[PDB]
């Protein structure tokens, strides 16, 4: 009974990073090496675990977070990073146990004239806690005058569009990202590698 990674990696639509998606993976055999040995991925990085030993490990549950960011932001999806993505959108903890997987999605996620669908949070007064998700759309007060829900001077919509165009430089092209978090509770393991 193999883990249904297909439903995550091959989903037609991916979330905007501010509204990142989480899927719980449970009660299955996880052949991580299939993904690790894949030619599909430009990033495959693990933390708290050896990438080559993944097929040997058991966890209570696995969580798959997925979303789109730009190429040069993939490096922010790692413990101990800062920037618009790590600070205001998707934050991994220092003690993260899991893998970060990314691939270029310019062919699916860019549009002629710019894709205005993919958003990130630009304005937030404080950084996210690890694994915090903020989907609020309150007008951001950048001065001492209240906004009263109305966009204008010093009163900003907090989300910005990437505006992905197929002609963008690679660092500015959309990348699909999957973060696998490995959860260990005091309970029987439900997700094991085939070579356990």
């Amino acid at each position, epitope marked *: 009974n193999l883990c249904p990674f297909g439903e995550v990696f091959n989903a037609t639509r991916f979330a905007s990073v501010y509204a990142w998606n989480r899927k719980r993976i449970s009660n299955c055999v996880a052949d991580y090496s299939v993904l690790y040995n894949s030619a599909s991925f430009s990033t495959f990085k693990c933390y708290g675990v050896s990438p080559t030993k993944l097929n040997d490990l058991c966890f209570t549950n696995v969580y798959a977070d997925s979303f789109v960011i730009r190429g040069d*932001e993939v490096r922010q999806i790692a413990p101990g990073q800062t920037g618009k993505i790590a600070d205001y959108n998707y934050k991994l903890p220092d003690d993260f146990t899991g893998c970060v997987i990314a691939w270029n999605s310019n062919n699916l996620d860019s549009k002629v004239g*710019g894709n205005y669908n993919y958003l990130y949070r630009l304005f937030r007064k*404080s950084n996210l806690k690890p694994f915090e998700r903020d989907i609020s759309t309150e007008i951001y007060q950048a001065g001492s005058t209240p906004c009263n829900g109305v966009e204008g001077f*010093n009163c900003y919509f907090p989300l910005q569009s990437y505006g992905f165009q197929p002609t*963008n430089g690679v660092g*500015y092209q959309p990348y699909r990202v999957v973060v696998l978090s490995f959860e260990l509770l005091h309970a029987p393991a439900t997700v094991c590698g085939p070579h356990h």
Partner: antibody
Amino acid sequence: EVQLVESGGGLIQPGGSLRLSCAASGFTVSSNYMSWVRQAPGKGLEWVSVIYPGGSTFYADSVKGRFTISRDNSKNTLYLQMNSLRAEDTAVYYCAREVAGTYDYWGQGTLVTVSS
Amino acid sequence: DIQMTQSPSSVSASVGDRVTITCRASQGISSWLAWYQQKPGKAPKLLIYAASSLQSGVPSRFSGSGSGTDFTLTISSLQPEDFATYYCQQANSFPGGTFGPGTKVDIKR
């Protein structure tokens, strides 16, 4: 009326340190992306440092390790602390408020001359 | 390591002339491109953001166009007060904005 008033530039020997100030009114410094941009005499504009509303800071490769951007909320002021200054750092330094990567308001500039 | 270039490096034009200056990014940057005017001894002033949007308070004779790698700033009818260095700026670079080298405009008469 948005105002950014800079201070603290002057003459400094090579290897010396200097702190620039930028007192803001008309927006809240701590709520904004704020940058320093410099211009060496007769040359173009060079972005040098940024501080994010949540406190993250970043620096141009040309100044990394030597400069520190900071702010004081109570004084609504932005600072740039510069160390190990060299002739290449001689420039007018501007502070600017940044909105989606563009600089809508700028200070008047402060001249830093690095010379013995 | 995007390079921003501008052309021509200088232009001399008469009052009332249409002036067209060019900015190029070495890789596509969509519409994330700003234009500034810098008078001698003054801070730059934002003219154009998002490649084509005119900043509040800026005269209507200034306009921007283009998307991707090639951008243009146009002064439709040059005024004597318009001598300056005009800079484009990539607005989506990290960690900071990336300025072009500037085009100097002077008034012919």
